[PDB]
Design a protein around this ligand. Structure first.
Ligand SMILES: Cc1cn([C@H]2C[C@H](O)[C@@H](COP(=O)(O)OP(=O)(O)OP(=O)(O)O)O2)c(=O)[nH]c1=O
Ligand SMILES: OC[C@H]1O[C@@](CO)(O[C@H]2O[C@H](CO)[C@@H](O)[C@H](O)[C@H]2O)[C@@H](O)[C@@H]1O
Ligand SMILES: [Mg+2]
Length: 580
DNA sequence: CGATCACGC
DNA sequence: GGCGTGATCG
């Protein structure tokens, strides 16, 4: 069965043809500054394996990699591009990324290696990466003969699969989504990840010191009030202390026992002194374990930067995710956690952090897609949509919607369109099921086009087998025709939500591409650091801030044209905290 | 490795 | 209600 190839000792001219499938293998999951273990090239002239020490120290190979006119087809080009950047080598000319192609054709497939993508087209002449490298503790690069055969088979699969994938993308009207949106975005994400974000490590260490002390204090107080020691970090052990020893009322249950969630503890606070201590301990512990220790573990000691990886081929709706570290979930809502953001600083002296965010983008997207006259008029008047909803469902004037009311209208605005029930909304708003049913009815009376959207998009999903977003991303929903009610219900909620969340994802991706082009045209030093779903974070010289204040919102506001305006709020400052 | 919890959008 | 990461338990 073996596949024929040349195990080359030196780079030859026929390896540098103007179209090739290229594999630049990085086996460590986190590819930042990781080793490249081998290279395979498949082109019109044959199949080749190259040792990295050789190829990457060859001026002609290096020049070929960087020549935009020499076209390469790859799988996970970002991984290769970033690992090359760490070696001071530029990769250009990537015209097809099989990972991004498979992701667009069906995100549910969970494609995370060439073999899985190949399976989508009945191509099985390549092994899964896990079969070759093993997993976890057993993980390891095999001897050269086995490694080279594997890389060549992956390159040969990419070579064969480009056309069928591109054909199906075209049938799906996703060809531009790949070539004009996702692939250009991949390069931008590569730059952002490689740039990293600088952190004030001394500040983090200091916070960590103060957290460890307070943690020790609250822990003893807790054991003192409980009349005993227990593992506070065990919801089960906690439940026993709270509901069996101290006999606090059981306000909520989970599947396997008593709930001890923050919301429940908040309701129990009045009942006993131990409760406030538990919340405090949990708050401190989250900051310490997840954020302080997590960030300090991954900061690069030479530059003080952290380098996330944006997974561009994971979420079912077309969002990015962020890992190791996750820079999309740094605290902000509560001041204590928000202080962590003080430790995220500009990479150079006399630079500043600039943050821009798409105010209520999901509801603006809903207004556009549903063509609800009331929702559209509200955004055209630049009303605060949560206050306007508060006004409609509670039947009050603007002047009398309290902050608590706005927070509630938020819950209604987030929940209804995404398929919340009367039961769940009642839980959310701490009112009766019947009370919540009345608000939902009033909501649909106020926003009838939204009701019509929910009905129509579910009907369409049932008819076509999938739902789509503004720029033609798709999500298949086979469960929407399940004879099982609960299973089907989940699918109906996905049908209503995906087009909204996914269109918002399309828009910000396009804005990132538009933004980078404008920044380059203007020769600004400003560059992107992070995306957090509906916001973009940049750093730049202080001397560029006035230009950015006009440029960034304009670019983001103009990324797409909807039936209502896109609104962008922006702030800058000396740290991410201050960009508020 | 599923549950629970807590953080973001 | 939707989409994520990850700490921690058992
Ligand atoms: C906080 C929160 C956000 N989200 C999603 C939907 C939100 O529109 C999006 C952004 O969060 P928010 O910025 O809090 O929502 P918003 O922009 O609509 O309202 P506000 O003017 O008060 O900022 O995150 C939820 O789905 N559930 C939630 O509880
Ligand atoms: O390089 C990211 C890219 O690779 C995949 C697997 O093909 O994910 C791998 O890398 C991630 C980033 O380090 C890890 O979180 C993940 O566990 C690992 O499998 C794709 O999922 C991703 O798009
Ligand atoms: Mg907002």
């Amino acid at each position: 069965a073996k596949m024929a190839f040349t195990l080359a000792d030196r780079v030859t001219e026929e390896m540098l043809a103007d179209k090739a499938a290229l594999v630049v293998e990085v086996v460590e999951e986190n590819y930042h500054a990781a080793p490249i273990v081998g290279i395979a090239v498949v082109n019109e002239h044959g199949r080749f394996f190259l040792r990295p020490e050789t190829a990457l120290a060859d001026p002609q190979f290096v020049a070929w990699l960087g020549d935009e006119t020499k076209k390469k087809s790859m799988f996970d080009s970002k991984r290769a591009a970033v690992a090359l950047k760490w070696k001071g080598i530029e990769l250009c000319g990537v015209s097809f990324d099989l990972l991004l192609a498979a992701y667009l054709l069906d995100p549910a497939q969970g494609v995370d290696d060439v073999a899985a993508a190949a399976k989508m087209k009945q191509y099985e002449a390549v092994r899964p990466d896990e079969a070759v490298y093993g997993k976890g503790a057993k993980r390891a690069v095999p001897d050269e003969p086995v490694l080279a055969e594997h890389l060549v088979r992956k390159a040969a699969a990419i070579w064969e699969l480009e056309r069928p994938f591109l054909d199906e993308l075209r049938r799906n009207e996703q060809d531009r989504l790949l070539v004009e949106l996702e692939q250009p975005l991949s390069s931008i994400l590569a730059e952002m990840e490689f740039a990293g974000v600088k952190v004030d490590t001394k500040r983090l260490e200091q916070m960590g010191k103060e957290l460890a002390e307070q943690l020790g204090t609250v822990e003893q107080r807790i054991y003192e009030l409980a009349g005993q020691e227990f593992n506070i970090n065990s919801p089960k052990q906690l439940g026993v202390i709270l509901f069996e020893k101290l006999q606090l009322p059981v306000l909520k249950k989970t599947k396997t026992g008593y709930s001890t969630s923050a919301d429940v503890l908040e309701k129990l606070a009045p009942y006993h002194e131990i409760v406030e201590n538990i919340l405090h301990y949990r708050q401190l512990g989250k900051l310490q374990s997840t954020y302080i220790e997590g960030l300090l573990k991954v900061v690069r000691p030479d530059t003080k930067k952290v380098h996330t990886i944006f997974n561009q081929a994971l979420t079912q709706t077309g969002r990015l995710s962020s890992t190791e570290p996750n820079l999309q979930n740094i605290p902000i809502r509560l001041e204590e956690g928000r202080k962590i953001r003080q430790a995220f600083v500009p990479s150079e002296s006399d630079w500043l952090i600039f943050a821009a965010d798409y105010s209520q983008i999901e509801l603006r997207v809903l207004a556009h897609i549903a063509e609800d006259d009331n929702l559209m008029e509200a955004f055209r008047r630049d009303l605060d949509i949560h206050t306007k909803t508060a006004m409609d469902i509670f039947q009050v004037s603007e002047d009398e919607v309290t902050p608590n009311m706005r927070r509630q209208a938020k819950a209604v605005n987030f929940g209804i369109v995404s398929g919340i029930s009367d039961y769940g909304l009642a839980q959310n708003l701490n009112i009766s099921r019947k009370e919540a049913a009345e608000f939902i009815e009033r909501y649909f009376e106020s926003f009838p086009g939204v009701k019509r959207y929910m009905e129509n998009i579910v009907q369409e999903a049932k008819q076509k087998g999938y739902v789509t977003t503004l720029l033609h991303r798709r999500r298949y929903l086979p469960d929407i025709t399940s004879r099982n009610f609960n299973v089907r219900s989940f699918a109906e909620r996905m049908a209503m939500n995906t087009p909204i969340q996914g269109s918002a994802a399309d828009i910000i991706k396009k804005a990132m591409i538009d933004l980078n082009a404008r920044l380059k045209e203007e020769r600004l030093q400003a560059h992107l650091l992070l995306q957090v779903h509906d916001e973009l974070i940049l750093e730049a010289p202080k001397e560029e801030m006035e230009r950015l204040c006009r440029l960034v919102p304009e670019v983001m506001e103009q990324a797409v044209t909807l039936r209502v305006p896109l609104k962008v709020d922006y702030h800058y400052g000396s740290t991410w905290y201050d960009a508020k």
